């Protein structure tokens, strides 16, 4: 590889304050990078990204762990590329060594082998040693800011042409193994850092039956998946990123969901009467400016006829405490002008005599629906509205698992006619929006691990748009016991093949 | 260089751990002198554990075996450990990996330390531990140490060890290149010997109720047996997948 | 100091696998221990614990941070004792060096100066160097298990006799500054450990107005403190430890609180009628065995007349969906046999015609009370019951701050007659019971820090029985704006003087 | 000797042509001094041509590629040749042949001279 460096730590050692050794035992293990696990299948046309792995302390667990107490780092990493292919499987693969500040728009096959690359092979026997020496623009990189460093871009080249057996296509699975060289050493030691850009997402050890639902205030009763239900829903509560940035109407509260706070108005009673006008604000004493939330925070996002309690400061025949039914059409039937996007909802009062009600600041908890459908409510007059996007593209063998609760409703036709679905419940939404992790990949592997037996129930990938997918080939419903704590393994890439669910 | 080989004939990747000085520590502790035998040494002998069959139907985050260091890695040392209390440990363990030149795949060993949780050993925990990755196709026996890094002078031979472990994980799962419907489930039998430093510290009488003793089944016949669900002789052992093979029958079952 | 050691790392270096250096820059800073900050006031009779600081990597932030990737440690620490006292303030103080496996039952003044101690003085000018060399019983200590190591016990001796000015008693504030010696080095490097016994409690960056209340399903509206209200209440929801061990009826859910799941029975209608019997179980499909929880998880713990919704599978005149009032006396008035401890509650149905109801598994969300009192409900017939203990002893200048919500109720006498109080809301209960921290002290300092200005609103200590205290000298109510994220500083001891609140 | 090989690991058959002395001829002709880069050299880089997929459905009188010598054999020299007029040529070309030990077959290269008809080869 033509690079020819001379120095990478003695350059920054003057203007560093203090440069710090690590220990001579971390410079001797090849411990694998978090997201460089590739698999060359023979049904892959050549010229695709196998991995794009930067420089940095986020290539070992040890450097990422120790780099939370320093202010930065210099020095050169080293890579052992290993491939799980014996003979009779020809086909090259190139590890190009792309510099910092090279744009990522396109990288075809005539572009890989134009860097100082190494053209290795699937048939190789010994592992492949390769330096990743940081071409700086500055003296030392900082460790709390992601920075344009040297990246290692691997791509197959004269692709894999091998003989495959029955029902098992021979993938050549390759791994990267990073190790800092003798040039790698951190700079000035700053001890207090609690939250870091190299921390791993953790997904706490709360049980999925002990956690609050993120779409309706009920404990989660089921944890199932349906290929017969639509695999691409457009939910607006329980949407989150792993970054912590919320999406849509989602509150960081289990008590705010499917509820709203407003200023009431009780006006009309002239023979048919019985209506109320709620001017929406916010559920923690704030205002309402219509931006991108499509509704105030925690507004009920489903089509039905929701009955809502209320706090009334009624003058005559009772104290300042009586609740009532308050039917409220959330559904597509626009009889009254239902618009939570301007923040004006209308609610029929009660089958009552005439009227005795007083306006004020109210907060309207829900209690029952009449007919549930999993479509979005009309937020503005039937017109469009800035929504959270639908749940993104899956691998075609995967469907999203969902977390069943059960509303209480009025049906008079059949019992338990509906159930409420979400992904990443409110104890994970309030987890992600409070820790605010820094993501590496777009997907994130999990293992569902029950407590008192340790049996791996399923593995599942948690996409960074905040939904958990699961590869179930089938067309029937199936459930899972709700006593397993979710636990991470690694930031797996987008097109990852998690095994199966039987 | 014995057979004709399209396979890696040699793995020696220099596992990075300082050599522990056992058995010069617990010699002043115990009030005895206890050599074992100079012929139990230099004799590679199969452990009563860990016979691992890697399959193509295995995820690469899946464990093949997890051997705790102890005298339950030979018939000899598990036989002598019925007498003694305590031991001080070193082993040479050879994995015997098999499978033709038409297989593929790697597998990592890992000398995981004693005071580490027995929960998640994921795929990404290979750089942290002193490890050796090994090709499945390899022809030689893979010798590797299995030493103890302990805080005491000797590990008591009952449930008091909390000692160092070998974790093997298939790191790249077993894709074959054969153009046939042939089962290439790579069957590997690993086998361990004690080093020139393993010894037992104190000599107690054999009690036969010992942990990791050789389990055995009663040698009668299968038709000389009483059926454990109806009082009748067994008129035939069989298998049938058409019957429901998750039955809920109560009598006749016992944890071993 | 008479100890006379010879070696502390070369003993364990044979049976270690690998011993690991740290770097030569961590062995050069005196960075202060987490809980050794004492203050000798002149009104302190001699013979009291100033600090009892063990050995270990939990004496620096750097050793506690780096010790999450090793399997253990050996070696000797070193202590710089500094005192903030100039001349004219005589009075000695002894740093005794107590061994491992010495019992902590009593330590009088004739016991301190009987160890290999150092008898230093308040009037000293240079700081006080002192070794803390680990007297092992084993080769290396493990780092994931707390272990009996050498402890440094300081105690005053011939006490402080100085001249004090007006209204400021001259405290001699002393600090400890730990630093590992050249003998300190870790052993075998085990990289993956996420949760550690040396991790610091963090208290996430959720706003107190965006968090769900832990006693009633409503968003927190106020954050106030009252010296006129009783400073020692006995709450049963929202009780937690920093350890993660829950106390009483507290669920790890915002939706389970003040609610219960049961098997219903609808039997009696004979002229006055209108009663239902709920046999309690659990709110996530479990049983109920009466142990120490005093009620099922999330049972409403207050005295009143709670009206609760229900899901009814009614045969005639409607579908399997209609909700109703269900008055239920939680209060001390034992008309019907109210007992949630055996799990049998009774609820009057409805001012209804006669009866049409069908039994089944129900879950009874609350909607309104008639008269709120902050006393515990009768859990078993008026008899006693294993309860969570009352909120523990304060420093006499401190009162617990509380988190206001507002129920909706029936009063017909006055509006907003009551408000609901808790400490550590459900997004902190579900935080502590999911992280499950390891505690060092009994108290834990916080700083209330508003977001868009950074103004320190108050400092407050979070006791390890799970309640936040606040030193407000006064007798009037005062509130705080609910937009400040709580942030920790250190594990302060029990008898700590946080400043004031004006 | 990197991988395990039932294949010919080495071809060096000593192509019989006298080495041409370029760039010492056209240095008095042009009125400039023009080095290129010492790092465009010693870096094998894929030509924007000639990616050839041999198949079993090919007659043995069939051509895989016909590369004329020029700066259109690298991205670098085809990028620099947008500026310049003229060049003096030498190349080292590496074919990367692939395929398992289960294939067969040969392929001839041929340094065909410039003034030869572009018809029947």
Numbering used by the authors:
A (entry chain C), C (entry chain C): 30 to 531
B (entry chain B): 16 to 271
D (entry chain B): 16 to 136
The authors write:
Norovirus (NoV) is a non-enveloped, positive-stranded RNA virus belonging to the Caliciviridae family. The common capsid structure of 180 copies of the VP1 capsid protein forming a T = 3 icosahedral particle is shared by all identified caliciviruses, which was first reported with HNoV GI.1 virus-like particle (VLP) produced by a baculovirus expression system in 1999. The VP1 protein consists of a shell (S) and protruding (P) domain.
Therefore, the VLP of MNoV-S7 was used for the high resolution cryo-EM analysis, and the 3D model was determined at 3.5 Å resolution. Atomic models of the MNoV-S7 VLP capsid were built for the quasi-equivalent A, B, and C monomers of VP1, respectively. For modeling VP1’s A and B monomers, 513 amino acids from Gln19 to Gly531 and 516 amino acids from Ala16 to Gly531 were used, respectively. For modeling VP1’s C monomers, 502 amino acids from Val30 to Gly531 were used. The models were also fitted to the 5.2 and 5.3 Å resolution cryo-EM maps of the MNoV-S7 and MNoV-1 infectious particles with high cross-correlation coefficients of 0.92 and 0.91, respectively, indicating that the structure of MNoV-S7 VLP is highly similar to both the MNoV-S7 and MNoV-1 infectious particles. To understand the capsid structure of the resting P domain conformation, which shows higher levels of infectivity, we investigated the molecular interactions between the P domain dimers of the MNoV-S7 VLP suspended in DMEM. We propose the following chemical interactions between residues on the P domain surface: Asn409, Gly411, Leu412, and Pro415 located on the βF''–βB' loop of the C/C dimer interact with Gln371, Arg373, Val368, and Pro319 located on the βB''–βC'' and βD''–βE'' loops of the A/B dimers, respectively. On the other hand, the NTA in the B monomer extends to the adjacent C monomer, forming a complex of the threefold axis, though the NTA in C monomer is more disordered. As a candidate, we found a potential interaction via a metal ion between two carboxylates (Glu223 and Asp231) observed in the folded, flexible hinge of the resting conformation.
